[PDB]
Structure 1
Amino acid sequence: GDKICLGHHAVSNGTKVNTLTERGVEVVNATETVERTNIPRICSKGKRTVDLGQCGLLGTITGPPQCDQFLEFSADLIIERREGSDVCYPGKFVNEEALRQILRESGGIDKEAMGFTYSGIRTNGATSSCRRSGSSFYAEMKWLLSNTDNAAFPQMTKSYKNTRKNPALIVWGIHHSGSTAEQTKLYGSGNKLVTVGSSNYQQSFVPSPGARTQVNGQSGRIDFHWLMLNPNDTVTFSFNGAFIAPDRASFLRGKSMGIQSGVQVDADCEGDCYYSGGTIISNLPFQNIDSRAVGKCPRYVKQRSLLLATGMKNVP
């Protein structure tokens, strides 16, 4: 008897997948859905890229020696590194991380002089912790001392209008001396106040002199503070010592992204999702590599693998 049979294909090596109803049912074919594959490099093709290396991001605004190349840097992609430091003379920024988040998407910075000038004080405060050709200081700032040791410090006001169309990033410092003796040697006796107001912003600052742990030969510290000054607004600085004054305001250039990483740049490969270990190049919807990956990324998931079937049940 003549007959015709209908059938479908099959193979000996089925791939196991999961369904609503069964774990490890075999299908003819399947494809991975969770990315595990990583390129151990920063794929920068098509993007202006700044590798800050020794230079801390916030340092680009104040300008310790490590950051000299980057005082007006310009970028699409910004890479911070572990060894980066924001300082030379010991100290830290208040609200540091917010400010980092601003600079990471800033496109870089452009610097304008604020035009302060000074009478009856010194301006060349310096220290062995910030060294270029011997003792020096933060490039974008001026360490104002009294005119001579112990001498009194003229009370002063200085202001600056932001005449541009974007907001201006303003930064200053409070010097906290290793002793009260050093505070007087530098700014003279009396207590010391520093007051800073725009219109949008009012705040105030007293130095806390006192012994601390010696960091880079230094027992003193510099508190850095900052604000955004709106277009046409003015910032005014009233003070009588312990003031580290800005020489230049900063302005944000455009748009960028910043990452933190421990691997080389590679301008020959292209990418859009990054993490500390490299770049994730992948069309898969999900990934199991790093939950803190940034850019335009597959969604991070707990599972190593989720196979998606791309053929029928295998019945061999």
Structure 2
Amino acid sequence: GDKICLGHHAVANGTKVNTLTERGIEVVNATETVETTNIKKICTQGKRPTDLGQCGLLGTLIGPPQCDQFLEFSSDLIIERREGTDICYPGRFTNEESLRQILRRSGGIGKESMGFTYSGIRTNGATSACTRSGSSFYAEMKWLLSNSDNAAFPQMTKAYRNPRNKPALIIWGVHHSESVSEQTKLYGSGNKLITVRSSKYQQSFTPNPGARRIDFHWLLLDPNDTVTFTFNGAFIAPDRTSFFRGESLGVQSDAPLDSSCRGDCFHSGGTIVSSLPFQNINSRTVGKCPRYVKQKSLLLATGMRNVPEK
């Protein structure tokens, strides 16, 4: 007689997914949840990028010849390159990595004079390591030494009050001479000490002669607080200080910039553009990113169990 039958759809070949009780069960339709497609470029559309190139991120503060174009910059996406260098004269920043992390999210920097004027000493200390218009020095810094060879450097005090609405990034250097004789030539004989003090900071520095270097040190000065420098030689003085602009991201990559694609997740290999919750491209990312997973593929079922016709 007459009859009515109830049923459901199917396809010839569905997609295999995993469940709590079964591996490789076939469903009508599925979708990927793990992103594996990478864009081998830095996507900078709708952003204000800064490609540092030759210049080191920490170099923007002290100003070696390679960072002349970045002494003041405004950015929301800072790109660091492998060839970047912070220094010209031998030496290093103490707490360098934590300072890089602050500068990466700063939004860029603005410079302001600290207003130090000097008397009875020389200010024009230069080096052929930092060559800018023939034998110069760090652009934001001043190399202080005696008026003539072997003369005694006077016990000096310089104070700076932060007049602004935000924290000031204060930078200073300690010069470690090639020898005891050279330290004597530049600053006069005897032991040297550099003391830096604020309401939250307190440190003393002694030069260690033997191999030519300038080591840089830093602090963040609160609004209306005063930083005090006491020194009798081997002191690299700040001429300017830095103030942060707003908000940014910092990326370490050798990938070319592209102004034709929009991205919010960045890594060394380029840009991840996805609406998916997970990614398998890179464990080290910056920005708004899917969580890193070790799996290549995790298919989510978007349909019923596939049961093809016999």
Q: Which residue of 2 aligns with 1:149?
A: 149
Of 257, 266, 272, the residue aligned with 1:274 is: 266
Q: Which residue of 2 aligns with 1:108?
A: 108
Please tell me the residue identity of whatever aligns with 1:233: D
> Which runs of no fewer than 5 residues in structure 1 stay unpaired?
212-219
Alignment length, in residue pairs?
308
Q: Which residue of 1 aligns with 2:277?
A: 285
Q: Which residue of 1 aligns with 2:30?
A: 30
Matched residues in 2 for 1:93 and 1:176: separation?
14
Question: How far 1:4 moved relative to its partner?
Answer: 2.3
Q: Which residue of 1 aligns with 2:88?
A: 88
Matched residues in 1 for 2:118 and 2:295: separation?
63
The SS at the match of 2:275 is: coil
Please tell me the residue identity of whatever aligns with 1:247: D
Please tell me the residue identity of whatever aligns with 2:130: C
Q: Does 1:244 align with 2:236?
A: yes
Q: Which residue of 1 aligns with 2:9?
A: 9
1:208-247 counterparts in 2 under 5 A?
208-211=208-211, 220-247=212-239
Of 250, 257, 270, the residue aligned with 2:249 is: 257
Please tell me the residue identity of whatever aligns with 1:157: T
Question: How far 1:3 moved relative to its partner?
Answer: 2.5
Matched residues in 2 for 1:199 and 1:10: separation?
74
Q: Which residue of 1 aligns with 2:196?
A: 196
Q: Does 1:184 align with 2:184?
A: yes
Matched residues in 2 for 1:2 and 1:129: separation?
99
The SS at the match of 2:289 is: coil
**TM-score normalized by structure 1?**
0.96
Question: How far 1:157 moved relative to its partner?
Answer: 0.4
Matched residues in 1 for 2:199 and 2:93: separation?
22
Q: Does 1:313 align with 2:301?
A: no
Q: CA RMSD in A?
A: 0.9
Of 283, 288, 297, the residue aligned with 1:296 is: 288
Question: How far 1:190 moved relative to its partner?
Answer: 0.7
Matched residues in 1 for 2:11 and 2:224: separation?
74
Please tell me the residue identity of whatever aligns with 2:222: N
* Per-residue Cα deviation, 1:63-106 (whole angstroms, up to 9, x for no partner): 00111110111111111111111000011111111111111111
Please tell me the residue identity of whatever aligns with 1:178: E
* Matched-pair identity in %: 80
> Which runs of no fewer than 5 residues in structure 2 stay unpaired?
none
The SS at the match of 2:283 is: coil
**TM-score normalized by structure 2?**
0.98
